[PDB]
Design a protein around this ligand. Structure first.
Ligand SMILES: C[C@H](CCC(=O)NCCS(=O)(=O)O)[C@H]1CC[C@H]2[C@@H]3[C@H](O)C[C@@H]4C[C@H](O)CC[C@]4(C)[C@H]3C[C@H](O)[C@]12C
Ligand SMILES: C[C@H](CCC(=O)NCCS(=O)(=O)O)[C@H]1CC[C@H]2[C@@H]3[C@H](O)C[C@@H]4C[C@H](O)CC[C@]4(C)[C@H]3C[C@H](O)[C@]12C
Lengths: 502, 129, 502, 129
């Protein structure tokens, strides 16, 4: 079948492992599906497409991905089989090749895929193509808790698919890979089971979004919706996180840090428009802040407008000691502002008529309302550098961000309609993803919004491993969803996985 | 007639041992109860025995989901008003014989008892026989 | 040895299970410790004490508690062994008895423990007492995902311990139970592994407390400390949760709901002390509130003093439309207040000199500061019923609550020292425990505060399954700990487990 | 899968004797030169090994025309930078497996050396094996 010598598994690794541990003999019976082992060949694909690419391990089997937390190592082969769904009137081939555990990377052209030990399968085959996945290695056994270099199966479209197609769907030929352990798979050394393994699928909090908290403005979340009208690729700086647990930009762990800052009180009176305080920013946990990777201290607002912090004012004037006054802060440029949170200084101005005898100390600020709010990056520096998180994209053709809109306290003088700020992930997911620190498998999760009472889907969205949710919308009108469901992770998908139209 | 179709999906060796039927419950009921030997002789259509796969369905949809019982037989769903109890296996035939131009695959699992009902995604329906 | 017939395991359950699945033969080799299978016999114990009581299952072995998520059922016996640590000069016995899988409950006197099939072990034995744990059952096999009635081992102190004791320690005789599967343990039917099982130990968020958020006042957490001076058994109503995921009282999921309410604006002018608004409370998620189990809507403040909500004021007077005024609210009794959040009505009063033309709508309130704050239950009803969470106790002799102190915005006229409100669990644990919904095993976790940089303990505290942390303190001065560590669950302990003095 | 296609075009007995490879050039080179015995074990695609027949082509068009050499193998086109010389035969597979609805025939000839290059009309490509 394939030009490879037989590869010794647990007989080479035996004289140097304390134990060689057997597996339930009912696991060598079933062909269980491989994660990311599915594809679809449309007649618009060019030969050379790489349909799947998956590496021999215990991550290919849900039985073994779970058994492989009790142990230290593994060795041995697997049996995979590729099923293809095409009738007698299709035409096209698919080459499945065994790539050795090195051989770096890059565009494998179809000229080069036929140079490995391979198998060339017609699309219109009946019974599933069975082929081995040998354990070619430099070492005696492998360690389960450390992804290493093992043999890959790479599938490539050799010649394109020639069929007819009615008007919809367009007849894609589907295919699925299913694996099981060969007769000589073994784990090595029984350890006590650990929970923070690497084959541990991303789970989400069981919390309805209406019960969540917003990420950019400290308020509850009042509605999740799609909206093809707003800027499709924003550059928010709060509520940015990586599904692998890395905080992006000025996103804080806590939700009390959102739109807030702990500052140094440097008070001095002035006979112009009122009192003006210059604040020397620090990190709200009390640690010395230095200009670094973030565009501002952790949690500093990321919107543009007229914000009004409150206080920590100790007044030595007789009659009262500690009060709560309302300062005022400008976030937009306005072409007259020394706004540089980056370097650790902000200017606040209250319109007072007399002297407020305020002691200099350490304060922290709480937003009260906003005047003239624009969804646009503020001035983290005057007109200067800002190492900031990139925009929120890119999306496939026909996919729009899913926003968690809340409403902030507006100071208005012309209307009363509530304004909607929105983020990509409520402040519960930003803490979940950081506290768990999962292992990103491919490129994008596949969530599934359900209703807990009824038990019916609402939509199938896609959480990219960069920390935002997309959704395949066709229309143009803002379509708002119920806010009483639960997000449920299904599986890992590639980037190009096309959703179902909502 | 043409054989540009799939000949037969002959039941693979599903990984499951044989299970005892009325031989365990016989010394625990106080009666000798037998059912017509002609009911075991022909395949009659279930009460819930009609589904359809359109091209508007997506991978993962549950086409049918029917618990082993006497509700799987018009004969035994009628006989089961006189008795309080049952045991034993059933043999199910699945008749999909779609056109020669269609393409697609269904997967029929054997979900054990006490397994939580609900989602049963497509990634995990293959972990069963 | 013991008067029991041999009990058939996997031979009775075989003709009715689809599969009978074997276990790694290296698991029948090691004696692994049983959870909660440890005790200690001091010379102050009276005979009749129940040292351990543990039920045959797969929860007795970390190998099987983990293997038992892949399967549906189990059957069979186990081998346990009791090791005792006493020398030749002790004296005392311990009776280990096999309790059948019924036989309800109650004080088993030592007269009755010797009536089961038992074994009477002298404290001064050398080699570990080995004894079986048979699977007496009414059914063919057991289901792994449903705790059922199985045979128990109960250990009782038969005659007391007679030894000498220098001056410290007081010579306790320790003992530990260790189990392994018998030769005929089996699981039943391979299912796909599930993560929300019942043998899933309580894990905690990896988040330093300084990064957390407070539970009673919406602010960061600034210091965790013990303090034997304050009321040792408070009755807080926010930050109360059960480790099994049940919210106690007026504790909300989110941290934005803390000390806040969404109310109905019922505005009307009055020529006395100013404007007064009566608020018809609702649940902040927008759902109709009815007087139920909670003493107030979810999140309503639980302290006593002079609180000042802000707004949602739409003013139809020309010049401005939406502003942010500061109302005022009294939480203490003051013997003149119609304060009844229970029934869904609160009174707010601002000191205005003219009419504020405020439209009636739906508002939500944000605290600004507090005047005269007392750690005491407010008036949820005038002088009437309050179905409320019980006090926070009881503690063992010499154990004091561990409080997460934050500082709230104080309006003062006599001093400037910051006041400290405090809760038992920061608002991250209240969301963690609810989102996971663990299974409480016995009575109290056993946390372990460590430092992530250094790698040395700070103290060993005890999280009771009622949602508060205790700590064995001897002295009397408030001892404050660093706030840069990590809580780490060790194991389940009983109530009477005595900590190590901090 | 369906067998309303042509089963196999099993190489007809092309009229040609067997030809000697490295057994003639071995006592005339001053080295013992062998190539990896695994290169002879799988069929890999030529460097010039991709053509296409559309319905806009006419009878007579030359679909491919490839001289025996080391340019017919990605393996040997790489090994042939270290050596100056070669001898021997090659085995070529031709993969056309068009749809079940297409119709047409290609003819693959064996043009000898020194035959003039250029036209090679359709009336004379059959005079070769
Ligand atoms: C001015 C603070 C009082 C709290 C307050 O004014 N508002 C809380 C609600 S809000 O956000 O204003 O909306 C006081 C009380 C707690 C103090 C902090 C705490 O003492 C913790 C550290 C201790 C360090 O010695 C100094 C910085 C510090 C970080 C302090 C800064 C500042 O003095 C704080 C923050
Ligand atoms: C008065 C709200 C504006 C937000 C605000 O005033 N402050 C937010 C910060 S703070 O807490 O005051 O500190 C408005 C905007 C969002 C509104 C809510 C949202 O429209 C959601 C539901 C919708 C229902 O139709 C009515 C109740 C409601 C629950 C609304 C109540 C109220 O009208 C809200 C809460």
């Amino acid at each position: 079948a394939v030009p490879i010598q037989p590869v010794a598994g647990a007989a080479l690794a035996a004289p140097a492992a304390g134990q060689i541990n057997q597996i339930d003999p009912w696991i060598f019976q079933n062909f269980v599906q491989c994660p990311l082992g599915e594809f679809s060949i449309s007649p618009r694909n060019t030969p050379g497409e790489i349909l799947f690419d998956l590496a021999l391990g215990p991550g290919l089997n849900p039985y073994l991905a779970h058994l492989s937390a009790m142990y230290t190592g593994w060795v041995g082969n697997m049996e995979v089989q590729l099923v293809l769904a095409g009738n007698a009137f299709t035409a096209g081939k698919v080459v499945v090749a065994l790539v050795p555990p090195y051989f770096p990377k890059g565009s494998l052209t179809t000229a080069q895929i036929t140079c490995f030990p391979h198998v060339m399968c017609d699309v219109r085959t009946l019974e599933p193509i069975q082929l081995p996945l040998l354990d070619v290695r430099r070492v005696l056994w492998h360690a389960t808790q450390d992804q290493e270099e093992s043999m890959r199966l790479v599938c490539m479209l050799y010649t394109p698919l020639r069929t007819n197609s009615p008007g919809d769907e367009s007849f894609v030929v589907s295919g699925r890979l299913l694996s099981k352990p060969a007769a000589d798979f073994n784990f090595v050394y029984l350890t006590p089971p650990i929970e923070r393994t690497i084959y541990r699928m991303v789970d989400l909090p069981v919390i309805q979004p209406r019960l969540c908290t917003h990420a950019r403005w400290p308020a509850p979340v009042y509605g999740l919706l799609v909206d093809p009208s707003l800027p499709s690729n924003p550059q928010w700086q709060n509520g940015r996180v990586h599904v692998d647990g890395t905080l992006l930009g000025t996103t804080p762990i806590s939700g009390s840090w959102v739109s807030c800052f702990a500052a140094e009180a440097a008070y001095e009176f002035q006979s112009g428009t009122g009192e003006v305080a210059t604040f020397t920013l620090i990190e709200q946990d009390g640690s010395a802040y230095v200009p670094g990777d973030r565009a501002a201290p952790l949690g500093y607002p990321d919107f543009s407008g007229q914000l009004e912090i409150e206080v920590q004012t100790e007044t030595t004037k007789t009659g009262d000691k500690l009060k709560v006054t309302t300062f005022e802060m400008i976030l937009g440029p306005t072409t007259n502002a020394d706004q540089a949170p980056y370097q650790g200084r902000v200017f606040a101005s209250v319109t007072a008529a007399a002297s407020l005898d305020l002691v200099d100390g350490r304060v922290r600020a709480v937003p009260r309302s906003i005047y003239g709010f624009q969804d646009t990056i503020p001035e983290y520096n005057d007109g200067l550098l800002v190492p900031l998180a990139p925009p929120i994209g890119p999306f496939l053709p026909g996919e729009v961000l899913l926003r968690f809109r809340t409403y902030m306290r507006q100071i208005d003088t012309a209307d009363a309609a509530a304004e909607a700020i929105d983020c990509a992930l409520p402040q519960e997911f930003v803490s979940w993803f950081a506290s768990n620190a999962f292992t990103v498998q491919s490129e994008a999760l596949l969530l599934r919004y359900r209703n807990t009472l009824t038990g019916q889907l609402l939509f199938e969205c896609k959480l990219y491993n960069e920390g935002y949710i997309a959704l395949s919308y066709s229309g143009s009108g803002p379509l708002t969803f119920p806010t009483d469901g639960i997000f449920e992770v299904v599986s890992w998908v590639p980037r190009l996985y096309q959703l179902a139209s909502v | 007639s043409g054989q540009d179709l799939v000949p037969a999906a002959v039941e693979q060796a599903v990984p499951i041992q044989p299970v005892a039927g009325a031989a365990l419950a016989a010394p625990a009921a106080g009666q000798i109860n037998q059912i017509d030997p002609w009911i075991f002789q022909n395949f009659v259509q279930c009460p819930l025995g009609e589904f359809s796969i359109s091209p508007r369905n997506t991978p993962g949809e549950i086409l049918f989901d029917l618990a082993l019982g006497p509700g799987l037989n018009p004969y035994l769903a009628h006989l089961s008003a006189m008795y309080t109890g049952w045991v034993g296996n059933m043999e199910v035939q699945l008749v999909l014989a779609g056109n020669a131009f269609t393409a697609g695959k269904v997967v029929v699992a054997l979900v054990p008892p006490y397994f939580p009902k609900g989602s049963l995604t497509t990634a995990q329906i293959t972990c069963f026989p």
